[PDB]
Symmetry: C2
Subunit: 284 residues, 2 copies
Amino acid sequence: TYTTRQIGAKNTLEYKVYIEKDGKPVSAFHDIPLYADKENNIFNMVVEIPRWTNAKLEITKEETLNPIIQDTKKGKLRFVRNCFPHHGYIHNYGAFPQTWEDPNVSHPETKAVGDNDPIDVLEIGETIAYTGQVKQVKALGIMALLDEGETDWKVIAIDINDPLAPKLNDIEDVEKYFPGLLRATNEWFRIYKIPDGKPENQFAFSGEAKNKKYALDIIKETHDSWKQLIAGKSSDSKGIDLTNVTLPDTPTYSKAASDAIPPASLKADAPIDKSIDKWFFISG
Amino acid sequence: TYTTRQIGAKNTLEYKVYIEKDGKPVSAFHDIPLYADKENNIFNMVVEIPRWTNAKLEITKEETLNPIIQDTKKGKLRFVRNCFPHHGYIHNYGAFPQTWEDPNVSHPETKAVGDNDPIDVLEIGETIAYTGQVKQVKALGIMALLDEGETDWKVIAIDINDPLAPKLNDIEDVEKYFPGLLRATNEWFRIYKIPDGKPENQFAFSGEAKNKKYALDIIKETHDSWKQLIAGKSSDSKGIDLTNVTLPDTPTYSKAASDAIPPASLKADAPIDKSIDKWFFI
Ligand SMILES: [F-]
Ligand SMILES: [F-]
Ligand SMILES: [Mn+2]
Ligand SMILES: [Mn+2]
Ligand SMILES: [Mn+2]
Ligand SMILES: [Mn+2]
Ligand SMILES: [Mn+2]
Ligand SMILES: [Mn+2]
Ligand SMILES: [Mn+2]
Ligand SMILES: [Mn+2]
Ligand code: NA
């Protein structure tokens, strides 16, 4: 059973959320199995950002056990700005554990190195998720986002517990039951960093949403990249903390790491600067 | 100075927000001047619904002093559903006090009776407002919404404190600085009740957002309607509570009404049913 251990108040630099397995903290990056049900293509998604929120919370690669913390820019807590007609993130945003967008090799489909992070997941279900949540999802498709010139695939997925899950089998179904979502997703990821002073992003395949099988292929490839990483065989692991508590055959396996995590110290959410309210009317 | 007195926890049936003037509750409907600055057409807007929220909070016409209370639905609270690509309300939503969409007569421009409510205001500034807030705004334009067959004008306005207030002077400026907002506004009010089983709404003038001059004329008309109402001279006030504490020449003037209001008893927001998360694709 997966639960969360929160330290500090949300929207602060001290905030951390560790994922616990049966009460004991494990690496949100390496210890949560990619597959919930491999042959049925059911994956374990680690949720980082709830739909319609702004705080850019992320599994941190450089902290032991890889807790979820808020990303920062120029020493300040990072909040993704509101880009009309969107409010914060338009999907429950997260990642697939045990995956890695290898930054050390140019990916052929996108002709760019990976962004050094687990593969990204956009969960489209009706319910708003929570940070640290481990939910089972089925992959429906995938988009080839070039984010700031780096291969940064976005998997389209849905919580298997969603009322519409049974009717969602492949990418075409998303357009049928969530008309306009895929186009909004393409737009969102193209323009969301413009309010930060960054260029518009781009997609390969003219922004086409590749199907479920294509998605599974990329997911599996990133899983293999991670296998090499966790085995300690990457030409450059970028300082990523590979400490894990469930992979005994790995060089960085460490039982002790779990008990070294502080106990929960959850505090009420800290206030967020009113500037984050601002709705930006921008475009590519 | 205007402040708020909150009773109970937000998102519960007991929740009430009264507006206070110098610490004393006053009617949110009748006691707040329509104009903050008449000469410059700067209006006082009573905020009911903060942008991106779902709870359908409204000035209550039938309760003394007209506190803001969440609309109810079959014994429970009423929440507006999320209609893709929108999250709850897409504007700070409220009304102009001392105005009334007369339900007793058909309105020429829309050819329908009014919805019996103060005129509605959409505040487009960047800052998310708060329930019970009295903010000063500039009118930019107006949309002729026919909500479920009733005249239900929607004033487009901007908080005078907004960084863009200086550049926003007439309806055309909304498209210039907030491209797409007006089209989205038209769509929002056309479909927001569909998830509730209601028909799609319609707008007069093909949904055109009339300019400031036009808006000022309609606002003035709803204000004249209220003047008639508050004077006790409407042919039918529809059971609206006309009690006020600042209009001593009105039949329903009663300063004691302020003192009758219980003290603030603010509680933490109550959780909202997760079903309200649902995003509808209409
Ligand atoms: F990432
Ligand atoms: F109304
Ligand atoms: Mn990042
Ligand atoms: Mn990521
Ligand atoms: Mn990225
Ligand atoms: Mn990424
Ligand atoms: Mn109403
Ligand atoms: Mn109203
Ligand atoms: Mn209405
Ligand atoms: Mn109305
Ligand atoms: Na990344």
